[PDB]
């Protein structure tokens, strides 16, 4: 069921227990982690925070802790699957559910004592109403009610996709309880901004959602702020920006930023070897210097830069980039330090989905929600750095796939798959950073190709994940239109196939879009998917 | 060829050109020669490019492009490598040390 | 002598299309828990076979290897069948093993 009000039937409630905290990796996951500790940590809520990675180690930690544990908060996760037959709780615990993810399960949704969905109402929600669901001529209507509920309920769950940001839930509540710092609400806009570089939501409402954000932010400038009295160096401001939508750009060369963004990257067609020279000629229109150009962004000369984002605009107009400007937030403190909301998110990311072998992906969690903080700047730095390799191996690897011609167009989808072995496979390996990367890829070739069939074709990508058992983790991905809703099918999809085929499919990720698989079965599950989707 | 083997092994393609005998052959590269010398005066089966286009062909190729190796299934040049070895400490034809499979992955690029 | 020809000639075809029929057949088991587990066992077992159509090609072609000196017609068939099933030639799993540990 649906909690109304999060202050009186969720924080009031767990504010005089011990709670426990399942949090998924993901950056929205994490920020709303941050709010809710910083809340708990005012109230002396004797809290226990676990990270959990898939549903199988959620599992584990649940069967570890629920002798001790009366009240549970899951953090992205949970909402899209039927958490009473997965966890198998007693009668008495209490599941408090903050999850993106839709569409939420019917049990869960219809669940009224045991299951609490932390999910604003006015969501994109289209819940099937409980008689159509759940319970001679009598028994003849019996199985056709039944029937029509099997074509409702796959109509509702075919489409998997995502809703209002966890992290923009928790501050919400902190506003509500009046206890909303401003790192609160800076740790929102990096979960929005989750969301918007991972493309889990829609252009308009990311734009939305930051209309929401620019109201508390305003109010945040206005505490202790006018135009005459203005606080120390020290504290921090978030500002809202109509800023640029090149990636980490004020931290390394505008060089090494349009090289690396996924949208300049595609359409100027880097990966091949005349799309330099059109990058060259977008950097003559503007009029920049080369040695500027490739000189690192905060010792780039200063006359350069104080119209660089509207000069980049009205050359990527005549261009036919049309929208290289994004509303987003930035956020200074101290002297020096300066971040747009993208570049916490993608240092922050790079951290979670890190290429080191040593620790471990607990371990790499750890790093990424200490980096949030501002006592760890060192660590967003370094995650900064890791995020710049990170992007690097990522064009390098669209660059491989497209000029090798690995992608190929399987009828209904297209098809890409990683090698073992080859460069950066171990850095791709994780789901998380393997969607991204099928994403960017996915641009890129609707940008290559020439064909108009292609351009609207979704894509299915391949990657060795393990030896030691012989699997591969498996992705889809909606087509990348401008039109697209950030609706897909693949997570339903995967699963007739594999049922359809007997295949040794295993689901672990919390997106149902990401599976493991045998490697032996991928055959006979790619010819089950080209004969389902037809 | 009364060189030594550290200038030897330096040499990753190393040919011998021979000139004996052989009837056919001589008449064809007489018939070569001649109609070279009718060619040039002050006035294989696949055709060749024009001089001028192989050298910006070359430079292109040379400046512009780059490659870059992902996999060369390492057990079939490895096994190769091995028994090469062996047949040349069996005859003393030419030595072969380290050099050759460099020369392999050089060759390919 | 030249009777080896033809007859490599005829296993050209038929091999083949019995190389794709038992793996189509082997591969699609679904009580196959592991294809490994497929194979049966006797007191000199100890390979790891792990993929039925692999180890058919492989003893077919050493009987066919051993039974002519002309090796030519059989190492095409092995570059053949191996990338039927593509699997590497020079790989460990490509070469011929005895199955049976003989003690005598």
Known sequence: ???????????????????????????????????????????????????????????????????????????????????????????????????????????????????????????????????????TMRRRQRREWEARRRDILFDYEQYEYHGTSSAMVMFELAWMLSKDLNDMLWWAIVGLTDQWVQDKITQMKYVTDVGVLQRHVSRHNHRNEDEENTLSVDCTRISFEYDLRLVLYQHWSLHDSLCNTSYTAARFKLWSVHGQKRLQEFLADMGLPLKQVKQKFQAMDISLKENLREMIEESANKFGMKDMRVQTFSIHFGFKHKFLASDVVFATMSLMESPEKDGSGTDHFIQALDSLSRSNLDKLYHGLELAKKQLRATQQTIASCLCTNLVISQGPFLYCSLMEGTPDVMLFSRPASLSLLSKHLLKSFVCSTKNRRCKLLPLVMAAPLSMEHGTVTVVGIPPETDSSDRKNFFGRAFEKAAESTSSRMLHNHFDLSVIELKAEDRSKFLDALISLLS | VDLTEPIISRFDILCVVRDTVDPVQDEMLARFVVGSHVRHHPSYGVEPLPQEVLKKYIIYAKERVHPKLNQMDQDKVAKMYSDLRKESMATGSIPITVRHIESMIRMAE | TFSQDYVANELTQSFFTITQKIQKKVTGSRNSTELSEMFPVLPGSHLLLNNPALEFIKYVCKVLSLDTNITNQVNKLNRDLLRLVDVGEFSEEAQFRDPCRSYV
């Open chain 1, 1 to 135: 069921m649906f909690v109304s009000d999060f202050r009186k039937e969720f924080y009031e409630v767990v504010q005089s227990q011990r709670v426990l905290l399942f949090v998924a990796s993901d950056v929205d996951a994490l920020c709303a982690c941050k709010i809710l500790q910083a809340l708990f940590q005012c109230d002396h809520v004797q809290y226990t925070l676990v990270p959990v990675s898939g549903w199988q180690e959620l599992e584990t930690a649940f069967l570890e802790h629920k002798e001790q544990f009366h009240y549970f908060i899951l953090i992205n996760c949970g909402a899209n699957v039927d958490l009473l037959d997965i966890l198998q709780p007693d009668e008495d615990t209490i599941f408090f559910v903050c999850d993106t993810h839709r569409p939420v399960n019917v049990v869960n949704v219809y669940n009224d004592t045991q299951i609490k969905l932390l999910i604003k109402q006015d969501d994109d929600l289209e819940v099937p109403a409980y008689e159509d669901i759940f319970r």
